[PDB]
From a paper:
The histone H3K36-specific methyltransferase ASH1L plays a critical role in development and is frequently dysregulated in human diseases, particularly cancer. ASH1L itself functions as a specific methyltransferase: it methylates lysine 36 of histone H3 producing mono- and di-methylated epigenetic marks H3K36me1/214,15. There is no information available about the N-terminal 2,000 amino acids of ASH1L, though several domains have been identified in the C-terminal part, which contains the catalytic SET (Su(var), E(z), Trithorax) domain, followed by a bromodomain (BD), a plant homeodomain (PHD) finger and a bromo-adjacent homology (BAH) domain. We find that ASH1LPHD recognizes H3K4me2/3, whereas the neighboring ASH1LBD and ASH1LBAH have DNA binding activities.
Titration of H3K4me3 or H3K4me2 peptide (residues 1-12 of H3) into the ASH1LPHD NMR sampl led to large chemical shift perturbations (CSPs) in 1H,15N heteronuclear single quantum coherence (HSQC) spectra of ASH1LPHD. These changes were in the intermediate exchange regime on the NMR time scale, indicating tight binding. In agreement, a 1-2 μM binding affinity of ASH1LPHD to di- and trimethylated peptides was measured by tryptophan fluorescence and MST. We note that this affinity is in the range of binding affinities exhibited by the majority of histone binding modules, suggesting that the recognition of H3K4me2/3 by ASH1LPHD is physiologically relevant. In contrast, the association of ASH1LPHD with H3K4me1 or H3K4me0 peptides was weaker (Kds of 119 μM and 1900 μM, respectively). To gain insight into the molecular mechanism of the recognition of H3K4me3/2, we co-crystallized ASH1LPHD with H3K4me3 and H3K4me2 peptides and determined a 1.3 Å resolution crystal structure of the ASH1LPHD:H3K4me3 complex and a 1.9 Å resolution crystal structure of the ASH1LPHD:H3K4me2 complex. The ASH1LPHD fold is stabilized by two zinc-binding clusters and a twisted double-stranded anti-parallel β-sheet. The structure of the ASH1LPHD-H3K4me3 complex overlays well with the structure of the ASH1LPHD-H3K4me2 complex (rmsd of 0.1 Å), as well as with the structure of the ING2PHD-H3K4me3 complex (rmsd of 1 Å), pointing to a conserved mode of the methyllysine recognition. Like in the ASH1LPHD:H3K4me2 complex, in the ASH1LBD-PHD:H3K4me2 complex, the peptide forms a third antiparallel β strand to the existing β-sheet of ASH1LPHD. Overall, the two structures superimpose well (rmsd of 0.9 Å), indicating that no major conformational change occurs in ASH1LPHD when it is linked to ASH1LBD.
Author numbering:
A (entry chain P), D (entry chain T): 1 to 6
B (entry chain B), C (entry chain A): 1 to 53
Write the structure that this text describes.
């Protein structure tokens, strides 16, 4: 799955 | 970014913390709100895959 | 449809009435909630074009 | 622009 963290 | 749609069950349009994208409708949700983490291989939001959260 | 993302300021994920699509981010919103009707030429949602509604 | 009514 595609994840991010800004 | 402006073309990344945030639609989490919390209803807050904000980009913070670990976030995950639905594989079908492309919306982003907060992992903590949805009860998951990035170790999942595949993800669908609560509208593409209705379920209790 | 399942591929059509509803993200209105009301926060209800329901397909009723006249709705309108943001030209940028493609989400759908209820015209009544957004204070618009079906005769506008271009539309942007309240996140692509922040404003009071 | 694009509108609908179900
Ligand atoms: Zn959330
Ligand atoms: Zn989805
Ligand atoms: Zn609405
Ligand atoms: Zn938009």
């Amino acid at each position: 799955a595609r994840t991010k963290q800004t | 970014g402006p073309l990344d749609v945030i639609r989490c069950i919390c209803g807050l349009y904000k980009d913070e913390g670990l976030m995950i994208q639905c594989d079908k409708c492309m919306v982003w949700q907060h992992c903590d709100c949805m009860g998951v983490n990035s170790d999942v291989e595949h993800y669908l939001c609560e509208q593409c895959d209705p379920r209790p959260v």
